[PDB]
Design a protein around this ligand. Structure first.
Ligand SMILES: Nc1nc2c(ncn2[C@@H]2O[C@H](COP(=O)(O)OP(=O)(O)OP(=O)(O)O)[C@@H](O)[C@H]2O)c(=O)[nH]1
Ligand SMILES: Nc1nc2c(ncn2[C@@H]2O[C@H](COP(=O)(O)OP(=O)(O)O)[C@@H](O)[C@H]2O)c(=O)[nH]1
Ligand SMILES: COC(=O)Nc1nc2ccc(C(=O)c3cccs3)cc2[nH]1
Ligand SMILES: [Ca+2]
Ligand SMILES: [Mg+2]
Lengths: 421, 440, 67
């Protein structure tokens, strides 16, 4: 088979994690009991990617639920599809990280991380051929950010030849008042740039701006923000869960998307928020990006787009050709044929056709510049720095994470300015 | 005797193998269970179709073939498909994890784990041959298995089978039907590595096949299914001389003598005609002259290039069906005085001609019209080097920035293998340029 | 002429054997070079992860020598 082991950490990680499993359980036609009641065998063809077959007639998410506070655990257990998760795969602390990255990475999380790895190892060894891991978490908090990146480092120690993808939620003042978040984000990025294959930059700033200005929702809830996230995560895993044009595991997908090891931060997009020309134009539009960046402020290294629904395959080919032609300047010339397309016959629930966009753009530097700005504005005053030195951290570790993300930005700028000649 | 063993590597290789062996079975009257009613010598024989098929005591006719992939889902469809009874389980070999479009994984990391088993299974086919002629290797340039594992296999086959002939059917990458970006890397690497171990290689440009399916068969958006059925017809035309008999039949090895003037110059350009739909073939006979002339229309080539802007070193015509020499000769005479056909000065200009009397077959529910006569031209043209030039350029663009290289280095490769492979390709392009310069 | 006949077929045997030999050697050298590189690459990766573990215990230790 081709297993993915799913891991969700912290509050944000667990609720977008629960949303992901709700949406794809619906698509694959299994109910909260874990029983299949669908209509197409295409729902079960690659059911093994995210589910274990269990007791007679029962499918159980290969998912591991982690948090330093027991609160969200009950929330998931109480939420829809709460009874589909394997009880033993619930691993929780009493502690509560309190938005302290150090507590997640070095102290509280470090004490809990072993029992997490125990559940990982149990799921992994039951795997016919594990293709990799995915982590849902935020970078602004303490558990999902600090312990999540600790978990990544530990997993890569036992599984150094497995693919590690993250869906990382980026902190924004428009959604969270918490002042210390640019510290937690910069510290986490410092880890993600070294130890992951793909990071989907789910930016709360972009999620907010979409709900507000496009979806016309005054004061949007987390449920509003996460509906976009679940729709996106459903899209980026469509080719893995349904048989189609792609015969591609996580490694092959990363190989054709990541030209440089550090530059693996993707800005995702969705459409709509309809004709194929309309779909295609929207998905390349800055308003439809899940990361607060303007693609026309940089260049695309690689692009992948998934169309879903019954539509003209010929028309998709032509519109993709059209877009690249009219926007030639925004794709790097020294990587030929860097824009790829797939089509799935099975549309998402509610939409008769949609499109999920995965962009590896140098314009993602804008997101890292935003964090760097907010980070540096705290670190000048050493504001709230004693929450980190208290756990045992040194100011140097802050300087290194700052400069490493600065290097990342300059590196994106390097390839943005590069020419064929 | 004179058996040929076919080896199908990776997704492209395997699925093209399906198309070919299905077509072979229809051509020889072999049923999906392997039974062949018209074959009266049970359990064996020295017939022409025995070059590609062995026989069991139960009357089953078995392809002299091995299917190999580092991932199981493509070959699994063969194991459960219409022709699953045709193949013995040990002919179908799969690993669990593919090469992820990475040459290094195909040639080293993943490939080395299965290469011994593959050679063992091939050895078991060879041991049943009374006069093995050589191998036919089907693979893509762009896949990690098609590139990496194939070159590993070709290297090992040279060691285990000396100078025994090895022919390739290689799929040249086209963006229209590919979702990979690193294929120029894999292409240059396998070509460099395989060059010394291949006696003759037939490149099939996916874009050429894609265009032909769109323009000639009116297929809106061709699939692998559409391409492979067309490719199988070209492969059939080329191997037909090995699988059928006939007075006017000329063996592929005899054409090969003409096609390869120097060891490295072993890439013939294939052109096939007629490719026509049922709708258009109704009430429209395609004469020998008409299909022969279509061989010099560049739109019908298996590889995108312009022979009219290059030089010929060989020209072969492989006919099948209702065709007699008189008509061939007349058609050729016309073409020679109306076409842009120019040979290098060190090679004779005559066209070598072969005719198999058994007419082309079509797969049920296919797109191709059933015709009374077809022809495949095999020419050695300097223009084929254009395909190298396009590929090498895409390589250069990415390699200058070392794009995607870390994936290869991470699996054990060095940058020195890249530059060395690229330099071989530069020398190859120069070789094709040098053979076209007039003598002193 | 007979001696020349023998020398021709002997040369043909010598060349075929030499081709087989050099192919076998060059391949064995390539697989060996690749095996070393890949191992060195993975070894370097693990060693980096091991400094981070060493760093993490110097962090937790620093926290106890804080009180
Ligand atoms: N003509 C044709 N081309 C194919 C077919 N399948 C794949 N290809 C081409 O092959 C290239 C990709 O290589 P694959 O053969 O799919 O990969 P592989 O050999 O299985 O190696 P892996 O990376 O391990 O999967 C692309 O250029 C495809 O267009 C096919 O059935 N017919
Ligand atoms: N989009 C989204 N963001 C969230 C959600 N929950 C928390 N966040 C964000 O995550 C950050 C806080 O991280 P949190 O999950 O509370 O930290 P932790 O539980 O201690 O690991 C803040 O910037 C929040 O805006 C959610 O359900 N959806
Ligand atoms: C859980 O981690 C991911 O799903 N990684 C991932 N990386 C991907 C890259 C591309 C695609 C995809 O669907 C494509 C569309 C057109 C060509 S590839 C899908 C991908 N999924
Ligand atoms: Ca017989
Ligand atoms: Mg494959």
């Amino acid at each position: 088979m081709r297993e993915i082991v799913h891991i969700q950490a912290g509050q944000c990680g667990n609720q977008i994690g629960a949303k992901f499993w709700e949406v794809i359980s619906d698509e694959h036609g299994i109910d909260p009991t874990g029983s299949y009641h669908g209509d197409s065998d295409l729902q079960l063809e690659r059911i093994n990617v995210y589910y274990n077959e269990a007791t007679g007639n029962k499918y159980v998410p290969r998912a591991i639920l982690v948090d330093l506070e027991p609160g969200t655990m009950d929330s998931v257990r109480s939420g829809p599809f709460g009874q589909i998760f394997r009880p033993d795969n619930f691993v929780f602390g009493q502690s509560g990280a309190g938005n302290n990255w150090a507590k997640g990475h070095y102290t509280e999380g470090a004490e809990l991380v072993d029992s997490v790895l125990d559940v990982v190892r149990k799921e992994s060894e039951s795997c016919d051929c594990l293709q990799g891991f995915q982590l849902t978490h935020s970078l602004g908090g303490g558990t999902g950010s600090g312990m999540g990146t600790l978990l990544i480092s530990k997993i890569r120690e036992e599984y150094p030849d497995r693919i590690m993808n993250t869906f990382s939620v980026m902190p924004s003042p428009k959604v969270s008042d918490t002042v210390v978040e640019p510290y937690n984000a910069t510290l986490s990025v410092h880890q993600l740039v070294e130890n992951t294959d793909e990071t989907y930059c789910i930016d709360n700033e972009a999620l907010y701006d979409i709900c507000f200005r496009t979806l016309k929702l005054t004061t949007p809830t987390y449920g509003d923000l996460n509906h976009l996230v679940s729709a996106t995560m459903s899209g980026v895993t469509t080719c893995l869960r349904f048989p189609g044009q792609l015969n591609a595991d996580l490694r092959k997908l990363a190989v054709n998307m990541v030209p440089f090891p550090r530059l693996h931060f993707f800005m995702p997009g969705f459409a709509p928020l309809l004709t194929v020309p309309e779909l295609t134009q929207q998905m390349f539009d800055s308003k439809n990006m899940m990361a607060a960046c303007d693609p026309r402020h940089g260049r695309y290294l690689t692009v992948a787009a998934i169309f879903r629904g019954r539509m003209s395959m010929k028309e998709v080919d032509e519109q993709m050709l059209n877009v690249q032609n009219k926007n030639s300047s925004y794709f790097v010339e020294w990587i030929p044929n860097n824009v790829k397309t797939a089509v799935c016959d099975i549309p998402p629930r509610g939409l008769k056709m949609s499109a999920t966009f995965i962009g590896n753009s140098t314009a993602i530097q804008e997101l890292f510049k935003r964090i760097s700005e907010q980070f540096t504005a705290m670190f000048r005053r050493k504001a709230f720095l004693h929450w980190y030195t208290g756990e045992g951290m040194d100011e140097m570790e802050f300087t290194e994470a700052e400069s490493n993300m600065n290097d990342l930005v300059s590196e994106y700028q390097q390839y943005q300015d590069a020419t064929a000649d | 005797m004179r058996e040929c063993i076919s080896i199908h590597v990776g997704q492209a290789g395997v699925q093209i193998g399906n198309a070919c062996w299905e077509l072979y079975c229809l051509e020889h009257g072999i049923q999906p269970d392997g039974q062949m009613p018209s074959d009266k010598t049970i359990g064996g024989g020295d017939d022409s179709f025995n070059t590609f098929f062995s026989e069991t005591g139960a009357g089953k006719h078995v392809p002299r073939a091995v299917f190999v992939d580092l991932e199981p889902t493509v070959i699994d469809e063969v194991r459960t498909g219409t022709y699953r009874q045709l193949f013995h389980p040990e002919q179908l070999i799969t690993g669990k994890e593919d090469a992820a479009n990475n040459y290094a994984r195909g040639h080293y990391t993943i490939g080395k784990e299965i290469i011994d088993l593959v050679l063992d299974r091939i050895r078991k086919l060879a041991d049943q041959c009374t006069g093995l002629q050589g191998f036919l290797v089907f693979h893509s340039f762009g896949g990690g298995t098609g590139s990496g594992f194939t070159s590993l296999l070709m290297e090992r086959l040279s060691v285990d089978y000396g100078k025994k002939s090895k022919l390739e059917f290689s799929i040249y990458p086209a963006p229209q039907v590919s979702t990979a970006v690193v294929e120029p890397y894999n292409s240059i690497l396998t070509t460099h590595t395989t060059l010394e171990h291949s006696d003759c290689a037939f490149m099939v440009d996916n874009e050429a096949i894609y265009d032909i399916c769109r323009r000639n068969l009116d297929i809106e958006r061709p699939t692998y299914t559409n391409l492979n059925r067309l490719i199988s017809q070209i492969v059939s035309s080329i191997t037909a001389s090995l699988r059928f008999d006939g007075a006017l039949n000329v063996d592929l090895t005899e054409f090969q003598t003409n096609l390869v003037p120097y060891p490295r110059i072993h890439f013939p350009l294939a052109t096939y005609a007629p490719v026509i739909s049922a709708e258009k073939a109704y009430h429209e006979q395609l004469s020998v002259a008409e299909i022969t002339n279509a061989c010099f229309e560049p739109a019908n080539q298996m590889v995108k290039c312009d022979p009219r802007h290059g030089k010929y070193m060989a020209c072969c015509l492989l006919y099948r069906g209702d065709v007699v020499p008189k008509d061939v000769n007349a058609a050729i005479a016309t073409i020679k005085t109306k076409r842009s056909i120019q040979f290098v000065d060190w090679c004779p200009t005559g066209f070598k001609v072969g005719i198999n009397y058994q007419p082309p077959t079509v797969v049920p529910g296919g797109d191709l019209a059933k015709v009374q006569r077809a022809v495949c031209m095999l020419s050695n043209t300097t223009a084929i080097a254009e395909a190298w030039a396009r590929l090498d350029h895409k390589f250069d663009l990415m390699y200058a920035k070392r794009a995607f290289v870390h994936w290869y280095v991470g699996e054990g490769m060095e940058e020195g293998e890249f530059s060395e492979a690229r330099e071989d390709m530069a020398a190859l392009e120069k070789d094709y340029e040098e053979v076209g310069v007039d003598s002193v | 002429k007979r001696e020349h006949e023998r020398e021709v077929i002997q040369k043909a045997i010598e060349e075929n054997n030499n081709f087989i030999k050099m192919a076998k050697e060059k391949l064995a050298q390539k697989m060996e070079s690749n095996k070393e590189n890949r191992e060195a690459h993975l070894a370097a990766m693990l060693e980096r992860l091991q400094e981070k573990d060493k760093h993490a215990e110097e962090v937790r230790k620093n926290k106890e020598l804080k009180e």
